[PDB]
Amino acid sequence: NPYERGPDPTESSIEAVRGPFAVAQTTVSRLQADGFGGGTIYYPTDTSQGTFGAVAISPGFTAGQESIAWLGPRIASQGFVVITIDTITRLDQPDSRGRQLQAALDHLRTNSVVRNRIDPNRMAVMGHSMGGGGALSAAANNTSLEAAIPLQGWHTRKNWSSVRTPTLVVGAQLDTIAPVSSHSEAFYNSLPSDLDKAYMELRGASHLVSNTPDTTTAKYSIAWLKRFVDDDLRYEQFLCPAPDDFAISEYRSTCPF
């Protein structure tokens, strides 16, 4: 694997708030962002290993970038360029959120600080609440995205037959805002049966789980990004088969990948 980055993984390594790569940050202003409300980019200083796949992350309704700020450094430390985006408006809907994510990854192709540190062919999308719905729309409008991860996703749309990108759907058990039955689960089973996919329910968690460091959320997001953005077969061990939980009330996948 030429995109393999970093030492072989451990259940501790993927659970670390910061992984191996030391990371730096650039702030995109609301003014210098075409199609989004700006954002904060996280990237590994180490270019010795090669270029890094990109990931865009959106917040949810009414929420600023702070909602999802913990995820940018935590994923980029493992070998990725991550943009934590603030929406054009706090009342932005999931479909716009899908546009603002393609806009944010596109911006990464021209950002001066991270143009040479990125691999423009291997990209992925992620979002919390409506942010997760966005992540789902950008995948359906682009069959080149290498991965997609909805987190307590919220959306009006449920059919996801078009989706052709490896998708990890994440739900919280006690969610009263975006119920799993009407959303997350509804999105996984609408996805292509033959694609590479997985659904994971988190135990005891409310809808606001992704708005605070959650180790279960981070480790599996980092394993999906590694298996599909870096084609890393070293991280398939953390997804196939299902793992011990305590935090996972439910899991279903299309293993083996």
Ligand X SMILES: O=C(O)c1ccc(C(=O)NCCO)cc1
Q: Which residues are catalytic?
A: 129, 175, 207
Q: Which is nearer to ligand X, 16 or 177 (CB)?
A: 177
Is the Cβ of residue 130 or residue 229 nearer to ligand X in the bound state? Answer: 130
Which phi and psi (to 5°) does residue 33 adopt? -135, 115
154, 132 Cβ separation under 8 angstroms:
yes
Cis peptide before 20 (omega within 30 of 0): no
Q: Which residue is nearest to ligand X (CB)?
A: 61
The residue within the footprint of ligand X, chosen from 16, 24, 177, 240 (CB under 6 A), is 177
The reply on whether position 154 binds ligand X by CB under 6 A is yes
SS3 at position 36: coil
Shorter beta-carbon distance to ligand X: residue 42 or 61: 61
DSSP state of 239: T
CB 105 within 8 A of CB 123: yes
Q: Hey, how many other C-beta atoms are within 10 angstroms of the C-beta on 163?
A: 21
How many chain residues bind ligand X (CB under 6 A)?
Answer: 5
Give residues 213-252 in contact with ligand X (rule: CB under 6 A): none
Binders of ligand X in range 60-89 (CB under 6 A): 61
Contacts of 116 (CB under 8 A, 6+ apart): 47, 51
130 vs 191, which CB is nearer to ligand X? 130
Pick one of 51, 65, 87, 129: the residue that binds ligand X (CB under 6 A).
Answer: 129
Give the footprint of ligand X on this chain (CB under 6 A).
61, 129-130, 154, 177
